[PDB]
Nucleic acid binder design. Structure first.
Length: 400
RNA sequence: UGUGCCUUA
């Protein structure tokens, strides 16, 4: 940093004024230095004369190249965000030009910035602080090709998409919904550590839940359709997503949320029914099977219960059935525990048994009797395992 | 006995 600003022992002077720095032409040097940038940070949080503001506007966010340089800088990016805030607060004659220029700078370099660890932070705060019409233009600058995928699955850039989803009306980012819905994109993005969070965030935004009551009816309609398009695509690839190490959380999210009930039933019918035994044996899909049991509508839950109890032919030699296999399987045991607990909740009053214009209590009692009889019969083998001991305990707790 | 992400000096 500038020698004129240092003391005898090579350290930044203590009585340095913001104006000295602004007048010196050496701001860029301070802004990329930790000590210098922090001094600037504190200095710009206080009172500022009009000229001080004017200079900061020109030197921090007035020229494209210096703007990118600081936005991509580990320290500088904070000063950029602070100066943008001040610019937005300053309604002088230059307000409109400064804001348009900031739109242009970011837009023209949108992809480059999104992917940069530090510039993406500048993007995200700009999206929620800038006038909405200008923030909307930033969204428009997002790429529509393979770069969008990279953005969705980047550990830093994914948060730009999530911010867009949070603070920008849907119409501006509808293209992302459809982009992600493409069979090949859906596969990649959902099967990615970060991308699956992005898809979930999208689904949540598209959900007609309590958080969306402020939407106009026209906007709800826009949302309903976008949700329906994305769900169609998720449903077509339900099997692949359910068994995937990352996308299974998405299927779980849809199956678990009452506000997505219609989609819950689709998914269960499309990839779960008739596959319950095999999926209960999958590391990742076993968690989806549990969610389905927990949240299926009663009529469908009866089919699921019937599939486990009666749906499969016992082994030709040993007589082992689906229930034997699942009870002792490293992943299947959790599903059977889930079925048991559902039944105990139902007959214990902890779970509503009325639905579809009828009291299914009789059904839960039947299922429970089956499980109890199985566990009674196999108590010795079962008690060798934590899972078996848990079920035995669950049943004993029910008696009393 | 069984999975993730939620990111800056």
């Amino acid at each position: 940093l500038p020698t004129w600003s240092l003391d005898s022992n090579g350290e930044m002077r203590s009585r340095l004024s913001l104006s000295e720095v602004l007048d010196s032409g050496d701001l860029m040097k301070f802004a990329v230095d930790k000590t210098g940038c922090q001094f600037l940070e504190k200095a710009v949080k206080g009172s500022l004369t009009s000229y001080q503001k004017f200079q900061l506007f020109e030197q921090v966010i007035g020229r494209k190249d210096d703007f990118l340089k600081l936005s991509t800088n580990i320290f500088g990016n904070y000063l950029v965000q602070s100066v943008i805030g001040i610019s937005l607060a300053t309604n002088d004659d230059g307000y409109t030009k400064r804001q348009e220029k900031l739109k242009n700078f970011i837009s023209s370099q949108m992809t480059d910035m999104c992917l940069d660890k530090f510039a993406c932070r500048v993007i995200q705060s700009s999206l929620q602080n800038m006038d909405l019409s200008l923030a909307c233009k930033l969204v428009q600058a997002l790429p529509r090709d393979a770069r969008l995928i990279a953005i969705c699955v980047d550990q830093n850039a994914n948060h730009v998409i999530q911010k867009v989803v949070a603070v920008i009306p849907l119409k501006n980012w509808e293209f992302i919904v459809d982009f992600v819905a493409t069979p090949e994109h859906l596969r990649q993005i959902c099967s990615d550590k970060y991308g699956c969070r992005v898809v979930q965030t999208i689904i949540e935004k598209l959900t007609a839940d309590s958080m969306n009551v402020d939407l106009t009816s026209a906007a709800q309609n826009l949302r309903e359709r976008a949700l329906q398009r994305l769900m169609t695509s998720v449903t077509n690839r339900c099997q692949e997503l359910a068994t995937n190490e990352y996308a299974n959380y998405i299927i779980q999210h849809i199956v678990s949320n009452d506000d997505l009930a219609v989609y819950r039933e689709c998914i269960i019918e499309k990839c779960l029914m008739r596959n319950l035994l095999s999926l209960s044996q999958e590391k990742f899909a076993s968690h989806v099977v549990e969610k389905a049991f927990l949240h299926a509508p009663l009529e469908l839950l009866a089919e699921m219960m019937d599939e486990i109890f009666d749906g499969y032919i016992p082994h030709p030699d040993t007589g082992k059935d689906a229930l034997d296999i699942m009870m002792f399987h490293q992943f299947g045991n959790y599903v059977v525990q889930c079925m048991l607990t559902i039944c105990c909740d139902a007959v214990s009053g902890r779970r509503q048994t009325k639905e579809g214009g009828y009291d299914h209590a009789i059904s839960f009692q039947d299922w429970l009797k089956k499980l109890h009889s199985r566990v009674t019969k196999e108590r010795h083998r079962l008690s060798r395992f934590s899972s078996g001991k848990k079920m035995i305990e669950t049943l004993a707790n029910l008696r009393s």
